[PDB]
UniProtKB/Swiss-Prot annotation:
One of its GO terms (cellular component) is cell periphery. SUPFAM superfamilies: WD40 repeat-like. InterPro entries: Sec13/Seh1_fam, WD40/YVTN_repeat-like_dom_sf, WD40_repeat_dom_sf, WD40_rpt. It is a peripheral membrane protein. Present with 21400 molecules/cell in log phase SD medium. This is Protein transport protein SEC13. It is found in: Cytoplasmic vesicle, COPII-coated vesicle membrane; Endoplasmic reticulum membrane; Nucleus, Nuclear pore complex; Vacuole membrane. Changing residue 164 to R: Leads to mislocalization of NPCs and overproliferation of the nuclear and ER membranes at 34 degrees Celsius. WD repeats lie at residues 6-45, 50-91, 96-137, 142-183, 190-232, 240-279. Pfam families: WD40 (PF00400). It comes from Saccharomyces cerevisiae (strain ATCC 204508 / S288c). Belongs to the WD repeat SEC13 family. GO terms for biological process: COPII-coated vesicle budding; ERAD pathway; mRNA transport; nuclear pore localization; nucleocytoplasmic transport; positive regulation of DNA-templated transcription; positive regulation of ER to Golgi vesicle-mediated transport; positive regulation of protein exit from endoplasmic reticulum.
Length: 280
């Protein structure tokens, strides 16, 4: 179902609506594109523009609040646009960070219309969209050099999300009505280089599963069982993948690992009966 040459500039992200019927591509050309996919067809609708620097990542909001797609660019700003009347418009612009923003994912509709922003400005922001338009932002420093990922943890307070460091550190953050904002929990060390990406699973089974990919060219699957329980570092393999590792994605169900390399190859992984990993 290829959509050959969607952009002019190299593409940095390919995400779909909750109903895999409409896509969203973003590139360096500072532009994002909306799509329609059927059997093998690709209808190109609008092309989102207002981004000064290369767009990095984008994320589809839950249909619960209509059609909304958020994008983050080098321009140190993340922007969201809705699709009222089949015509794409820019609803709000979030630019609190001072430097590139490399990741932006939406919170489980349960939580609400929340967006988690992680900038290379070393900080991270949490923003929910009220009514009138003016939101109440929440920012908290998260890493030394910077921040590269900010995946969320499923619903359960009890609001958690993992961060990937520019300083090689993976962290866990849980809300706190007494602290007024998300505070640190874990600080799982493991990578020798920078944490390129970290995604948290929705697999509600007995134990929690977290993925961490990095310039150190390895994935460390962080498995923990309960509050007490510490996270068990686990090398996806006791060798190095020839190139870096940029993305890690969790399948809806069946909990399978989508590990987008850098050697330009995508690999899939599963945890056999023991607790190790194998292809698919």
């Amino acid at each position: 179902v290829v959509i050959a040459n969607a952009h002019n500039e190299m593409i940095h992200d390919a995400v779909m609506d909750y109903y895999g019927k409409r896509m969203a591509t973003c590139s360096s050309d500072k532009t994002i594109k909306i799509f329609e996919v059927e059997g093998e067809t690709h209808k190109l609708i609008d092309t989102l523009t207002g981004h000064e620097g290369p767009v990095w990542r984008v994320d589809w909001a839950h249909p619960k609040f209509g059609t909304i797609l958020a994008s983050c660019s080098y321009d140190g700003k993340v922007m969201i646009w809705k699709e009222e009347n089949g015509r794409w418009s820019q609803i709000a612009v979030h630019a609190v960070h001072s430097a590139s923003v490399n990741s932006v994912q939406w919170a489980p509709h349960e939580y609400g219309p929340m967006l988690l922003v992680a900038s290379s400005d070393g900080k991270v922001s949490v923003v929910e969209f009220k009514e009138n338009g003016t939101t109440s932002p929440i920012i908290i420093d998260a890493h030394a050099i910077g921040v590269n990922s900010a995946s969320w943890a499923p619903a359960t307070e009890s609001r958690k999300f993992v961060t990937g460091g520019a300083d090689n550190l993976v962290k866990i953050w849980k809300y706190n009505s007494d602290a007024q904002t998300y505070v640190l929990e874990s600080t799982l060390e493991g990578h020798s280089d920078w944490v390129r990406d970290v995604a948290w699973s929705p697999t509600v089974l007995l134990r929690s599963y977290m993925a961490s990919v990095s310039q150190d060219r390895t994935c460390i699957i962080w498995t923990q069982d309960n509050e007490q329980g510490p996270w068990k570092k686990t090398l996806l393999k006791e060798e190095k993948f020839p190139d870096v590792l940029w993305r890690a994605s969790w399948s809806l169900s069946g909990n399978v690992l989508a590990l987008s390399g850098g050697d330009n190859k995508v690999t899939l992984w599963k945890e056999n009966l023991e607790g190790k990993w194998e292809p698919a």
